[PDB]
Amino acid sequence: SGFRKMAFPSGKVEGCMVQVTCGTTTLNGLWLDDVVYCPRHVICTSEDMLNPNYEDLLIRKSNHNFLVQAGNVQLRVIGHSMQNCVLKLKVDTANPKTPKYKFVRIQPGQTFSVLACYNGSPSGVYQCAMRPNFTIKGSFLNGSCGSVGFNIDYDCVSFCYMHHMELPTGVHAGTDLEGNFYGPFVDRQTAQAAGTDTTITVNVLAWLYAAVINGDRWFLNRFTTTLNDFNLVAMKYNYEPLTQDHVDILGPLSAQTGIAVLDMCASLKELLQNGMNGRTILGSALLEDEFTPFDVVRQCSGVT
Amino acid sequence: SGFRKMAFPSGKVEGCMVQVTCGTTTLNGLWLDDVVYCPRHVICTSEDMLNPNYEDLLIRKSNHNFLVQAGNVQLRVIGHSMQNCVLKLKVDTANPKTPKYKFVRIQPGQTFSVLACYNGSPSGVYQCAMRPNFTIKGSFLNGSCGSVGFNIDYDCVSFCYMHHMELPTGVHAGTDLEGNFYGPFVDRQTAQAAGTDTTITVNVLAWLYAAVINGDRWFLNRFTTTLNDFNLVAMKYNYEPLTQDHVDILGPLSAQTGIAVLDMCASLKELLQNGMNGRTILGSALLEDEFTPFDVVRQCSGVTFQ
Ligand SMILES: *C(=N)[C@H](C[C@@H]1CCCNC1=O)NC(=O)[C@H](CC1CC1)NC(=O)c1cc2cccc(Cl)c2[nH]1
Numbered sequence: 165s166g167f168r169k170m171a172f173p174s175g176k177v178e179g180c181m182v183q184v185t186c187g188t189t190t191l192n193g194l195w196l197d198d199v200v201y202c203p204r205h206v207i208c209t210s211e212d213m214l215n216p217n218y219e220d221l222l223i224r225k226s227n228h229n230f231l232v233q234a235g236n237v238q239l240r241v242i243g244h245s246m247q248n249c250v251l252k253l254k255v256d257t258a259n260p261k262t263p264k265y266k267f268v269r270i271q272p273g274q275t276f277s278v279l280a281c282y283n284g285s286p287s288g289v290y291q292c293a294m295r296p297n298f299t300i301k302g303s304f305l306n307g308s309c310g311s312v313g314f315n316i317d318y319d320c321v322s323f324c325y326m327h328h329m330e331l332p333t334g335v336h337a338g339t340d341l342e343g344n345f346y347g348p349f350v351d352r353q354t355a356q357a358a359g360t361d362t363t364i365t366v367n368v369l370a371w372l373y374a375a376v377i378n379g380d381r382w383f384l385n386r387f388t389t390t391l392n393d394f395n396l397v398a399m400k401y402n403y404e405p406l407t408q409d410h411v412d413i414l415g416p417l418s419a420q421t422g423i424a425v426l427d428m429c430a431s432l433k434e435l436l437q438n439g440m441n442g443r444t445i446l447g448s449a450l451l452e453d454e455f456t457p458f459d460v461v462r463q464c465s466g467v468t
Numbered sequence: 469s470g471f472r473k474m475a476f477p478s479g480k481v482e483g484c485m486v487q488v489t490c491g492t493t494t495l496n497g498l499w500l501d502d503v504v505y506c507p508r509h510v511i512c513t514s515e516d517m518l519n520p521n522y523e524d525l526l527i528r529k530s531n532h533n534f535l536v537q538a539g540n541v542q543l544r545v546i547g548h549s550m551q552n553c554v555l556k557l558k559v560d561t562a563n564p565k566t567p568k569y570k571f572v573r574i575q576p577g578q579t580f581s582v583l584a585c586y587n588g589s590p591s592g593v594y595q596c597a598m599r600p601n602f603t604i605k606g607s608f609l610n611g612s613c614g615s616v617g618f619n620i621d622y623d624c625v626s627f628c629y630m631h632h633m634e635l636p637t638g639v640h641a642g643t644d645l646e647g648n649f650y651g652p653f654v655d656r657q658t659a660q661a662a663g664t665d666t667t668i669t670v671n672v673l674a675w676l677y678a679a680v681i682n683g684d685r686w687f688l689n690r691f692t693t694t695l696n697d698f699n700l701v702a703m704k705y706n707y708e709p710l711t712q713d714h715v716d717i718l719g720p721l722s723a724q725t726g727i728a729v730l731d732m733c734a735s736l737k738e739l740l741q742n743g744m745n746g747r748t749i750l751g752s753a754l755l756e757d758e759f760t761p762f763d764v765v766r767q768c769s770g771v772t773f774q
C-alpha cells in the first residue's frame with residue numbers, strides 16, 4: 165500500500181543529456197541518433213532575448229558557434245536548423261545510448277517525469293502534470309533549459325516536454341520535442357501570464373479512488389448525482405468539466421473499489437461545498453489533481 | 469524557482485536490479501560484483517512466514533533452489549549465506565554495470581531515493597525520509613521487497629535501504645544492505661508497531677527556508693524566541709527537540725535568506741499554535757519534514773551527478 169508521486173526510472177534518458185554552449189549561454193540538449201535538440205534561445209545574447217528575430221540570429225551563427233559536450237567528449241556540430249522553438253544540431257556521432265523513443269504532444273491533465281539537468285548532468289527526477297493552462301509546477305533554475313519530460317511505455321521513451329521558461333507566477337512553460345510551445349507562450353524575455361489555473365477534475369477523482377484503495381473512506385457518502393449536476397457545481401470552483409469519456413477512463417478504478425464514478429462525483433461535490441475541515445486524504449490537506457487514472461492504476465496494481 | 473520532492477537519477481541503480489525466485493516466492497535482488505542481496509524471507513512459504521526459523525529454512529535450500537534472472541540473463545547461483553535479514557547469493561558473473569558504491573546505515577531524519585521494483589524491473593523512483601521511528605512513507609505492493617533506497621554522491625551510490633515489510637499504520641520498514649532492520653522490526657508475518665511518529669523539526673525549518681527562497685514569506689513574523697521556549701511548544705506537538713547542532717546545520721539557509729534560525733523557529737512556533745489558516749507553503753497545507761537542509765541547498769543551487 166501507500167501512494168507517492170513516482171517518476172519513471174531516468175536511466176534511458178540520462179544517456180541522452182548533453183551540454184550545449186553558444187557564446188556565454190550554456191544549457192542542456194537531448195542527443196538522439198546524430199541530432200541534438202535544445203531550446204533555440206541558446207543562440208541569444210541578453211540584448212537579443214527581448215525581441216529576438218530567431219530567423220536572423222540563426223543566420224549569423226555557424227556550426228562552430230555550438231559547443232556540444234557529452235560528458236567529457238566534445239561532439240562535432242556539422243549542421244544546425246530551427247524547427248519552431250527548438251534547434252536541431254546535426255552531430256557527426258550517433259548517440260550509442262539512443263533508446264527506442266517517440267515524440268508526443270501530451271494533452272492537458274496528463275503527467276510526465278522531468279529529468280532536471282544543469283550543464284548536461286541530471287540533478288533529479290520528479291513527476292509533473294501538464295495543467296489545463298499549459299503550465300507545469302516544476303523545479304527549474306538557471307541553465308535548466310533543455311531538461312526534458314518523458315513517459316516510458318514497454319521499452320519506449322515518449323518525450324513530451326522540453327523546458328524553456330519560468331512565468332511570473334513561479335510556474336513553468338516549454339515545448340514538445342518539435343518546438344511547439346504548450347499554451348500561448350513565446351521564447352522571449354517578457355512577463356507572460358498563463359490562464360486561470362483550472363483543476364483537472366478527472367485527476368482529483370482518480371486520487372480519491374487511490375485514497376479508497378489505501379483505506380481513506382471518510383469522504384464516501386451514500387449520495388449520488390448526474391454528470392450535469394456535478395459539472396454545474398465544479399465549474400463554480402474552476403474545476404474542468406467531467407465528460408463521459410473521463411467516466412470511462414475511471415472505469416477500472418471504479419470497478420476495483422466498487423464505487424461508480426457518479427457516487428465518487430457526489431463525494432467530491434460534498435468536499436468542494438463543505439471543504440475538508442482539516443482532515444487529510446492520502447496525507448494531503450488539499451485535493452490533488454496531478455495523478456492521472458493511469459498513475460493511480462500503475463501504483464495500485466503494480467505495473468513496472 | 470520551484471521546490472519539488474526530487475529523487476536521484478536512477479540510472480546507476482537500475483542496472484543492479486534482478487529477480488530472485490525460490491519455490492513460488494519471487495522478489496527483487498541487488499546485484500553488485502558477483503553477489504546478489506535480497507530479503508531472506510524469499511525462502512519462506514505462507515505456512516512458514518508467521519514464526520519462521522530462518523536458520524532451519526535456509527538449511528533445506530541449495531544453490532539450485534535460487535533462480536536469479538537479470539532481465540533475460542540467467543545468473544548461476546554458486547553460493548548462499550545469510551547475514552542478518554539478507555541473503556548474499558554468490559553468482560558466477562560480476563554485474564558489468566556495478567557502479568561505485570558504499571553501504572551506509574542512514575540516520576533518522578536523513579532522506580534517500582527509493583527505486584520501486586517488481587520482478588527485478590524498476591517501476592519508479594521517489595524520495596523518502598528515514599523517520600525518527602525508523603519507518604518510511606513509501607508506495608510498495610506485493611513483490612516490491614528487495615527494492616533499494618540510495619543516495620548519489622559524485623558518481624558513488626550509497627545504498628542505505630532494502631524494503632522488507634508494511635506495518636499496520638500503512639508505513640514501511642526495511643534493512644540496511646547488511647540486513648539489519650532500521651528500528652525494532654522483525655521479518656515475520658506479524659502486525660508490528662512503530663513508535664510515536666515524531667516530526668523532524670530541523671527538516672520543517674529547512675523546508676520553511678526553501679519556501680522563503682521561493683517567495684512564500686507570509687508566515688515570517690516580527691517575533692523571535694530561544695531554543696528552550698521553542699522546544700517547550702515543539703514537544704507538545706511531537707516535534708523532535710531542536711538541538712544547537714540543528715541550529716548550526718541551518719546556518720547557511722539562515723544566511724542565504726537573512727532570517728535568523730531563531731526568527732524561523734518563532735515562525736514555526738506560531739504555525740504549530742495557530743495552524744496555517746488554510747493557506748499553503750510551497751503548495752502544502754501541512755508542514756513538510758522530509759527535506760534535509762542539504763536537500764534544500766542542493767535543489768536551490770542546482771547540484772548535478774557525474
Ligand atoms: C532556461 N535555462 C531558463 C529557465 C528559467 C530561468 C529562470 C528560473 N527558472 C527557469 O525556468 N529560461 C530562461 O531563462 C527564459 C529564456 C527566455 C524564453 C526566452 N527566460 C525566462 O524564463 C524569463 C524571462 C522573463 C521575464 C519576465 C518574467 C519572467 Cl518570470 C521571465 N522568465
Ligand SMILES: *C(=N)[C@H](C[C@@H]1CCCNC1=O)NC(=O)[C@H](CC1CC1)NC(=O)c1cc2cccc(Cl)c2[nH]1
Nearest residue numbers: 165608611612613633634635636655656657658659
Ligand atoms: C515484500 N515483498 C512484501 C511487501 C509488502 C506486502 C504487503 C503490501 N506492502 C508491502 O510493503 N512484504 C511482505 O510480504 C512482508 C513479509 C514478511 C516480513 C517478512 N510481510 C508484511 O509486510 C506483513 C505481514 C503483516 C502482518 C500483519 C500486519 C501487517 Cl501490516 C503485515 N505486513
